[PDB]
Design a binder for this molecule. Structure first.
Ligand SMILES: *[C@@H]1O[C@H](CO)[C@@H](O)[C@H](O)[C@H]1NC(C)=O
Ligand SMILES: *[C@@H]1O[C@H](CO)[C@@H](O)[C@H](O)[C@H]1NC(C)=O
Ligand SMILES: C[C@@H](c1cccc(O)c1)N(C)C
Length: 532
């Protein structure tokens, strides 16, 4: 039976799923770890004890306990990211889409969802691996991991809540793929891990972490870097927030044992309710529980690891979307609202700058403002709005990614950089938000091929082109077809620093993606703040 697969953990029974006039197998909800419930909350993941009998892998699993966005009730643009299954601490499962007939040893792609490490689901409609698995003949896997305090509460030194447990969930899922994907026709020697936002950061973190390197072949990072300012915290900061969380829940704060015991007795929603109260600054684009630089998962500082070449050397394909800041400005900056063009005043511009660079002194704030202000037309509401979008995006995603790409490329075996600047025609979010972060995913997952989704013919073509770029790269370490008549996506080199735009227009190659702004963020500003 094509829908029955025997693994080292037990037999699983998938389901025949229809996809673009055909069908494929889908093994949904396969457990890869023991439910992190009870005294297991905050602890490292334990492997899923093998089971007797057949595991029903015909339906999606529960989503992990997480903060749910309710800013725009009923709005698809926001709810399309919210959990679409019952939330549960028992959420460490993975889904696999297998081509029919079951392949023998084909390329495997493992998707790691984003969501600032505080949210995310593998079951979202935009993450349906159906189209990519079918169109590209790949075994597509989507894993899950604990988010929020559940996956990142860090009381370093403690065995009960060491921190980084959400990253270990990812690793365990990767371990399970390593050990069993062969039974689904996947080639364990050719596994490409790919993710967006916190998932992209995660991908880079697995490239860095010694304990994860051997579990995959290549990597794809979309709008995420392990070095993003919001993707990790020091062990001191993690401990600080863990205690403050306990303080929010009236916990005995005399010992880690009592803090952790208290936190474990709290219902999931209780931790989620006060989750955001632990942030150190009035800021945007900062999340409470994220990976901690523990000296275990990450041997030393990300920067030193990057400098020394202390990371997995392989091929990587990565990039960003044009407007990486609009989302967090809409949700937290004064003057922005979903239903207006959000033209920003000078007053709100400076308030935004302050929210964007949390612990920057006045001089730092001045450096940012001068850098992003057109003094010939400083009251231009559209320029002030777009200027803020750039500040938030550059600082939080684009420039950190550029720093990582340049550091990596020095030791890597091939880099491919893209700049996705096509706004989906059916995008429900306002126009001012632009090519919003996360809206390239639908193209990566081939949603534009489904006519009912209302995409243009051009968008379907772009989707197919992106999917083939992703799959060909995952399969060969090069997004380009060996000897083809199509425009060639050049390799990013330390010298040339080439990249391509990803849109419905004919491929165009550029160099030094936002160098001007990134020299400011990566070189100048850090030096300024260090001195002051
Ligand atoms: C779960 O597995 C059983 C195996 O007998 C199957 O009959 C059932 O239909 C599956 N659940 C769903 C919702 O299909
Ligand atoms: C990648 O590695 C192979 C073998 O070590 C080498 O021949 C090739 O030149 C490398 N490519 C890049 C872009 O570094
Ligand atoms: C999916 C994506 C997202 C995109 C836009 C808005 C959200 O609230 C979440 N994650 C990765 C950060």
């Amino acid at each position: 039976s094509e829908l029955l697969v025997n693994t080292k953990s037990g037999k699983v029974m998938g389901t025949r799923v229809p996809v673009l006039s055909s069908h494929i197998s889908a093994f949904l909800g396969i457990p890869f770890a023991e439910p992190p419930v009870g005294n297991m909350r905050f602890r490292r993941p334990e492997p899923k004890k093998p089971w007797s009998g057949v595991w029903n892998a015909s339906t999606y699993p529960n989503n992990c306990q997480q903060y749910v966005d309710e800013q725009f009730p009923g709005f698809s643009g926001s709810e399309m990211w919210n959990p679409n299954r019952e939330m549960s601490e028992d959420c460490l499962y993975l889904n696999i889409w297998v081509p029919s007939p079951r392949p023998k040893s084909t390329t495997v792609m493992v998707w790691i969802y984003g969501g600032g490490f505080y949210s995310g689901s593998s079951t979202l409609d935009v993450y349906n691996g159906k189209y990519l698995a079918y169109t590209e003949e790949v075994v597509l896997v989507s894993l899950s991991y604990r988010v929020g305090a559940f996956g990142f509460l860090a009381l370093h030194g403690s065995q009960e809540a060491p921190g980084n447990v959400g990253l270990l969930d990812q690793r365990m899922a990767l371990q399970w793929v390593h050990d069993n994907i062969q039974f689904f026709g996947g080639d364990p020697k050719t596994v490409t891990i790919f993710g967006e936002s916190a998932g992209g950061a995660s991908v880079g973190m697995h490239i860095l972490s010694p304990g994860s390197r051997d579990l995959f072949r290549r990597a794809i990072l979309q709008s995420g870097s392990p070095n993003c300012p919001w993707a990790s915290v020091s062990v001191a900061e993690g401990r600080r927030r863990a205690v403050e969380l306990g303080r929010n829940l009236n916990c005995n704060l005399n010992s880690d044992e009592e803090l952790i015991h208290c936190l474990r007795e709290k219902k999931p929603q209780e931790l989620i309710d006060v989750e955001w109260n632990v942030l150190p600054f009035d800021s945007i684009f900062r999340f409470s529980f994220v990976p901690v630089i523990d000296g275990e998962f990450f041997p030393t500082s990300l920067e030193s690891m990057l400098n020394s070449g202390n990371f997995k050397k392989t091929q990587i394909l990565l990039g960003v979307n044009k407007d990486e800041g609009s989302f967090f400005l809409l949700y937290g900056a004064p003057g922005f609202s979903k239903d207006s063009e959000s033209k920003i005043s000078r007053e709100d511009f400076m308030s935004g700058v302050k929210l964007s660079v949390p612990h920057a002194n006045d001089l730092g704030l001045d450096a940012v403002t001068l850098q992003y202000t057109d003094w010939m037309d400083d009251n231009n509401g559209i320029k002030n709005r777009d200027g803020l979008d750039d500040i938030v995006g550059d600082h939080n995603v684009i420039c950190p990614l550029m720093h990582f790409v340049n550091k990596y490329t020095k030791f890597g075996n091939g880099t491919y950089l893209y700049f996705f600047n096509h706004r989906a025609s059916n995008l429900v979010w306002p126009e001012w938000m632009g090519v919003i972060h996360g809206y390239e995913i639908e193209f990566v997952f081939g949603l534009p091929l489904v006519k009912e989704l209302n995409y243009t013919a051009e968008e379907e073509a772009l989707s197919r082109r992106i999917m083939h770029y992703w799959a060909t790269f995952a399969k060969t370490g090069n997004p380009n077809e060996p000897h083809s008549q199509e425009s060639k996506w050049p390799l990013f080199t330390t010298k040339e620093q080439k990249f391509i735009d990803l849109n419905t227009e004919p491929m165009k190659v550029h160099q030094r993606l936002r160098v001007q702004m990134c020299v400011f963020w990566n070189q100048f500003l850090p030096k300024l703040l260090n001195a002051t």
